[PDB]
Design a protein around this ligand. Sequence first.
Ligand SMILES: Nc1ncnc2c1ncn2[C@@H]1O[C@H](COP(=O)(O)OP(=O)(O)OP(=O)(O)O)[C@@H](O)[C@H]1O
Ligand SMILES: Nc1ncnc2c1ncn2[C@@H]1O[C@H](COP(=O)(O)OP(=O)(O)OP(=O)(O)O)[C@@H](O)[C@H]1O
Ligand SMILES: Cc1cn([C@H]2C[C@H](O)[C@@H](COP(=O)(O)OP(=O)(O)OP(=O)(O)O)O2)c(=O)[nH]c1=O
Ligand SMILES: Cc1cn([C@H]2C[C@H](O)[C@@H](COP(=O)(O)OP(=O)(O)OP(=O)(O)O)O2)c(=O)[nH]c1=O
Ligand SMILES: Nc1nc2c(ncn2[C@H]2C[C@H](O)[C@@H](COP(=O)(O)OP(=O)(O)O)O2)c(=O)[nH]1
Ligand SMILES: Nc1nc2c(ncn2[C@H]2C[C@H](O)[C@@H](COP(=O)(O)OP(=O)(O)O)O2)c(=O)[nH]1
Ligand SMILES: [Mg+2]
Ligand SMILES: [Mg+2]
Lengths: 14, 14, 683, 683
Amino acid sequence: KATVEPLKDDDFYF
Amino acid sequence: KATVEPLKDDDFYF
Amino acid sequence: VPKWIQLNNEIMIQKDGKFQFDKDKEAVHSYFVDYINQNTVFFHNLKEKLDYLVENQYYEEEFLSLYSFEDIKEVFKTAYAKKFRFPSFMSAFKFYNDYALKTNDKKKILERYEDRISIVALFFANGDTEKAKEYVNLMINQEYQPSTPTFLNAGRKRRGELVSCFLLEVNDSLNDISRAIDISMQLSKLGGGVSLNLSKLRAKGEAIKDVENATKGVVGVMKLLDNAFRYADQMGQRQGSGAAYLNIFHRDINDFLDTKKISADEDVRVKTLSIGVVIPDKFVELAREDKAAYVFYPHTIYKEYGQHMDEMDMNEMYDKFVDNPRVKKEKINPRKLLEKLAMLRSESGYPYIMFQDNVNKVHANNHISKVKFSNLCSEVLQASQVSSYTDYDEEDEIGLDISCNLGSLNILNVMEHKSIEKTVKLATDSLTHVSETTDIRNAPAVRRANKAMKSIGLGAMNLHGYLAQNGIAYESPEARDFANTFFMMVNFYSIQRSAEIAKEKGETFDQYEGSTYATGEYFDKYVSTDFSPKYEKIANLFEGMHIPTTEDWKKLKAFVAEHGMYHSYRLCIAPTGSISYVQSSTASVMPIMERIEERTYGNSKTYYPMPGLASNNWFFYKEAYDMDMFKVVDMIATIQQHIDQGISFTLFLKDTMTTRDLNRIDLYAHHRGIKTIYYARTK
Amino acid sequence: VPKWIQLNNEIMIQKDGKFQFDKDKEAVHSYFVDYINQNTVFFHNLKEKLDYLVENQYYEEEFLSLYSFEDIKEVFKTAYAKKFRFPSFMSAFKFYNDYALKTNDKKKILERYEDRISIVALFFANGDTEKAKEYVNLMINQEYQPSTPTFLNAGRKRRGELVSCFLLEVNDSLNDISRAIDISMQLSKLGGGVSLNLSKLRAKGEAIKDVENATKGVVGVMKLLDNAFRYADQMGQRQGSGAAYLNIFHRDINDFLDTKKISADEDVRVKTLSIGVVIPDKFVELAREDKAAYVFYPHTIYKEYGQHMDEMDMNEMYDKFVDNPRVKKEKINPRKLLEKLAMLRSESGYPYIMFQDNVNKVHANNHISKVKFSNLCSEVLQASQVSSYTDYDEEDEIGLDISCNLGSLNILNVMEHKSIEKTVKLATDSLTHVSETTDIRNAPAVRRANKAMKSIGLGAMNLHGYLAQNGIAYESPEARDFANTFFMMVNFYSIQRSAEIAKEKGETFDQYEGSTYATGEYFDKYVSTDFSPKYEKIANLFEGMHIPTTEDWKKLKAFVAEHGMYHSYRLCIAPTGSISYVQSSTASVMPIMERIEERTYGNSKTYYPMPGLASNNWFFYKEAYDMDMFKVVDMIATIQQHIDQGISFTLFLKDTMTTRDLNRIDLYAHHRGIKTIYYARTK
Ligand SMILES: Nc1ncnc2c1ncn2[C@@H]1O[C@H](COP(=O)(O)OP(=O)(O)OP(=O)(O)O)[C@@H](O)[C@H]1O
Ligand SMILES: Nc1ncnc2c1ncn2[C@@H]1O[C@H](COP(=O)(O)OP(=O)(O)OP(=O)(O)O)[C@@H](O)[C@H]1O
Ligand SMILES: Cc1cn([C@H]2C[C@H](O)[C@@H](COP(=O)(O)OP(=O)(O)OP(=O)(O)O)O2)c(=O)[nH]c1=O
Ligand SMILES: Cc1cn([C@H]2C[C@H](O)[C@@H](COP(=O)(O)OP(=O)(O)OP(=O)(O)O)O2)c(=O)[nH]c1=O
Ligand SMILES: Nc1nc2c(ncn2[C@H]2C[C@H](O)[C@@H](COP(=O)(O)OP(=O)(O)O)O2)c(=O)[nH]1
Ligand SMILES: Nc1nc2c(ncn2[C@H]2C[C@H](O)[C@@H](COP(=O)(O)OP(=O)(O)O)O2)c(=O)[nH]1
Ligand SMILES: [Mg+2]
Ligand SMILES: [Mg+2]
């Protein structure tokens, strides 16, 4: 359990 | 649990 | 609230100081005319019904195609001519909830009692119209009841197997353990209960190809089997049931028993796996003398002697094992082990106890093999040969894995009809047909042993019901006299039917010539001792029915010697759990547990008085917990002397009695010739 | 406290502000002179030692009989001619504690490093003295390290299998599940890790031959496999390790992941079964656009289309699955599933992530099958065909189950010797020999695929050690340039050696003609793009060594078209856990976790500086956790483009990083063409 953080888009683009 | 009572020698003959 | 269960609950309302037993007749009448006739699918004619059932995958076309529809109509008329009426609400409820055929959505009812009986009879007869009518008469009179698998699945397309008891021998190899797991899952998938012998498996701390302390023992295989049975649970409606058996002289016996302790860890305890312990006379002798017993490492014995420990006579090889330095043994206290067995049975009902020398001193097929373990119900006692499952590329040596078809005579209805001979012979024929039509294509040893041994199990029920309805106490000597005569007659007619089947088919069971039937030693007590009733009260119960004498037994012995026997084993008394309600009979030959049985089905509470219970025979229906277990042992041993296999013998214990009392009951059962002890039920 | 342990502990004692790295040479010298030379059994001549080893069931007489004793003596001379010295105490300790041959009581030492290398080389050569000497030179120079199974077991009578990675397909049937459990136990018995594809198994709540909602799903099989691996614990020596793979579009994916939660129930949690998730590009596309995704019941798809769900391309078939009313599905949130994956990897390091379309877009054997899952170490990516294990009486339909032989080039030693071509070709020959000499009698699909595919895995190690000892940062573009050139050369020479073996034997692997090697599509990027170093420093590292050009790749393409390819698969970068210490190398192509390794053996603690660590190159040995995981992904993707199978890619995470950070790393790995992700290691 480090820290749950949601994927807030733009994380699928590079 | 049921009470544990040791077997006697006479218990093996009928 | 349903009207029928409301009427059924008026039994306990005591009017004028008595239970209203007649309410159950009103209860079943209301049950029918308010639920069953409403929910029953009715067709214009039987032809439309049969066509509907065959077309929509409810029945099998092959067995119905052996009769012209006029013959099937005649069979159904014979079933309905009796106009059978369930005497109690529980009988009809259990039938129409467990065995009656229902639509694919479990919405309506397709089969009545007569329809199911007619279908089972046409399945049994295999093309014979007169035989089908005879089976219809036998079952509609409730003289004979096929087991739950057969009665439930006979003639149904999407069905399980007609056999539900299987016994597997596991060899001491990983290939054999994997095959045992696979076969256990395959047979549990079919709905059968599987028993496994774990005595040939080497103990914990044995070498696996010259690396020592490598084997996990029988407890690892026990965990594997427990998870295999949890996986193959058939939707979970009836979860996979398995039994494991270990010889008491196995080194892993203490760890084997520790799997049932309440304080057992999750990495050891098994939940879906029943356990049985096989006790040779040597262990009882060692405990009696308070000497130091030894448990042995099976692999050391196999390496030293070339045979498995359980394949050898412990009463003649125990001292050789102890004196052998190359055999590894562990010191145990046999009396401490007996006390642990008693404590475990008190706290959990486990293990099953098999007295190996009690089974094998009267075993008829010791030439094939000795009986090394029992089934999940602890009453099947047959010779088995272990298989040698090899690598994938190599051929397997298929042994003999036990399986028998179950069937119960209703003692009350058989005695009322004075039809011991006809019922026994017809039941033997039906069980033979079930054996012949059973083909397990994923258990090679079960298949081979079913084809070779042709073993059947013909049990009985309603013994206590018949005795209580005839004014005979279960513990009374008259009850044991009746049981002696009745089961001697059953054995006589089963042997006669087996010999007649062998003569007609021209074949006997495999290795019959080495059996005690062929040598004639089996018939010694029957040609020497007369089993006619010793009491005038019992002798009148058999009036109008011929009791075979010593001369009749000599003639039967000559007949068997000249024609042989078709079945290696014929008689085994199973628990007969749920079919006892349908037949309105007490369960098996054991005494009743409750006079009026209270059950809760869903959110409804209903009560089941014992069959025939009234005020005139209230005290003859003595509960099993209130009676002396020594007299019950005497009764079961009287019955056991006429039964070639075992009897599922449940011990009914009070809370007051200690573990010493349970041990005394076990030792008296061993002394009296009891082959197996099923359960230690405590109230 | 041992003298060598004290000397090794003086490394941490900082003298003049620097670690005493030179104490490890003193530590290893003391270790040898005080323990190894004392506990090494010495013989008057090599003949006496060899006779003692063969006659005392230590070696195999079959492979040693292929040489005259003069040839074996010359091979041992070649091994001892190098005068190899272990540079660090940990190298010698690991070798003499894990791989050196010991007496049956594990008291004395029979094999030195040279003896083990000579025996392995003599086993590899299979009768060729010059080839054996070449293998001796290759291994004593530590340019090539055979895997732990091969190095430990080659030429040993009481040996396990030389292969330890197996990949099994499990078909949707009880027969196939039981066979999978059996084969898993048999392979774990041999000491090999077993990976099982559970995607074909129908989900929980599916119908079993007209009985709806009867299947326990993949989790029941998971429990069965976990207990099977716990039982088959390698004779109680090393814990049985197995892996289960499930497609992310499988309906039981959430139940599959819940088996690794810390709060998982004991009837759901699996302990010894690693889990890997297969993710097609369709799932990543659905999560990218935040569209709600569907997981499908595999049996409905199989019934509708006649093909397994994992046998079909989800990119084209996903819409047809969703729009098909006869295909059962449940809505999921793909982004929530990705976050759950990242949370599970943070908590426990599981599951492995296999990007299905990254593997199959460059897979050379898609005609045989697509790559559906990976091994226990997440680097084996080969085509598999599921086997149809039928009933006992019937004939099974044997498919292809993956099992490849592992070997590792030492990048530092291969680079310093300027022997990429020779080391690669000799390693290919040795791996081919291991493949041919491997015969597994209880896994028919594994044996068939080993005989047909002839797949090998040639990995690499000491990438970070070589780079840090040459003043190159692991994340630097020059490091990726070196990896590109080096692994292009490795791929070139492995393809050349495979085609040479095919020409020599006149045979290719089964179904080679449909591969991209046969059509030339494999060589497109090699005949179109130049992979020479783009940096002068990197180009100087390859001085004296011919880097294959575009014309060389065209010649290789023509040679492969003319003569074929012997190995379906050649290169896979395994983790190389314990053999890295013996080779004084950093593990695999991964960066180092710690600069100096602190471990406790027995009651004494040991210190292991990374090989070549000093004051000058201290900061080039950057710890993996301090590194940017994006640059590590870039490096592995640079290597992955020359490796036909996968690479064991461990994510090294800090405690401060979020679930979003792990998800970003996974998505960038997917974007960059990473095939598999092994572990999420958090500091
Ligand atoms: N106890 C019962 N067991 C079996 N079927 C029953 C029972 N009670 C009722 N039924 C069913 O309900 C039908 C009607 O029951 P009912 O009590 O009217 O019997 P009957 O045959 O019309 O008359 P009677 O029993 O008074 O001679 C029966 O034909 C039978 O199918
Ligand atoms: N680091 C090491 N790696 C391998 N073997 C070693 C190592 N250190 C010592 N030995 C072994 O111990 C023996 C004694 O070596 P030592 O350094 O004491 O002197 P030596 O006999 O002059 O050495 P060498 O034979 O190597 O020239 C070596 O011959 C070798 O077998
Ligand atoms: C027998 C059995 C199977 N299963 C699972 C495992 C199998 O993948 C699946 C059924 O496989 P099968 O055993 O092959 O089912 P079947 O042949 O009897 O009928 P059908 O093939 O039409 O379904 O269900 C259980 O979950 N529990 C069980 O008890
Ligand atoms: C392989 C294996 C066997 N066993 C036990 C169970 C078997 O009853 C017993 C026999 O295993 P086997 O499969 O017969 O192993 P083996 O034939 O190689 O060894 P041996 O030469 O002694 O026959 O070993 C384990 O407990 N764990 C294991 O992992
Ligand atoms: N009609 C009919 N008869 C059924 C059904 N189930 C069982 N039977 C039994 C009742 C009779 O004993 C037998 C013949 O019934 P039928 O076909 O109606 O014949 P019949 O009454 O014209 O002679 O079949 C059923 O559903 N319908
Ligand atoms: N003598 C001896 N030599 C060993 C042993 N283990 C490995 N060797 C290697 C060392 C040499 O390279 C090779 C030959 O040794 P040898 O038999 O003593 O040969 P020689 O020098 O007498 O001709 O074997 C060993 O135990 N004894
Ligand atoms: Mg064996
Ligand atoms: Mg199937």
